[PDB]
C-alpha cells in the first residue's frame, strides 16, 4: 500500500503487517455516492440565482 513514513523507510511496506483494512460496505457505498455527486455537477450547464 501507501506508507506515511514519519521516521524512515525504503520504498513502501506491506499492509498485512499493521492489518489496516477497509470494509466492502463502506468502500462500495462511497463509490456510488461519489459517482452520482459528480454526475449532477457535470450535468448542470447553467445556474440561475436570485438575490435575497
Amino acid at each position: 500500500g501507501v506508507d506515511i513514513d514519519g521516521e524512515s523507510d525504503e520504498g513502501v511496506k506491506d499492509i498485512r503487517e499493521e492489518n489496516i483494512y477497509d470494509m466492502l460496505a463502506t468502500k462500495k457505498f462511497a463509490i456510488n455516492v461519489a459517482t452520482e455527486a459528480a454526475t449532477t455537477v457535470l450535468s448542470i450547464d447553467q445556474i440561475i440565482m436570485a438575490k435575497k
Binding site: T35, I47, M49
Partner: protein, 71 residues
C-alpha cells in the same frame, strides 16, 4: 460542512451527498468529497477537449458497473 456558510449552490450538492455517507454507513465521508472533487478535475480536460458532457456521464455509468463487479 454544517458549520460553514455555503455561497454557491453547486457546492451544496456535494454537501448533501456527504451527509448520505454519514447517515447510513457513517464512515468514508472524506472518501466521498475528495473523490468527487477529482472527478471534476479529470473531466475538465474532457470538457475542454471537445468531448460532450453527455458521453462523459455515460462513460462513468459504464465504468461504475465495471468497478462494482471487481469489488
Amino acid at each position: 460542512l454544517r458549520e460553514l456558510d455555503i455561497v454557491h449552490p453547486a457546492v451544496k450538492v456535494l454537501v448533501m451527498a456527504t451527509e448520505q455517507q454519514k447517515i447510513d454507513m457513517g464512515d468514508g465521508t472524506n472518501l466521498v468529497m475528495i473523490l468527487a472533487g477529482e472527478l471534476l478535475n479529470v473531466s475538465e480536460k474532457l470538457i475542454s477537449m471537445g468531448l460532450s458532457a453527455v458521453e462523459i456521464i455515460q462513460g462513468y455509468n459504464m465504468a461504475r458497473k465495471f468497478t462494482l463487479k471487481e469489488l
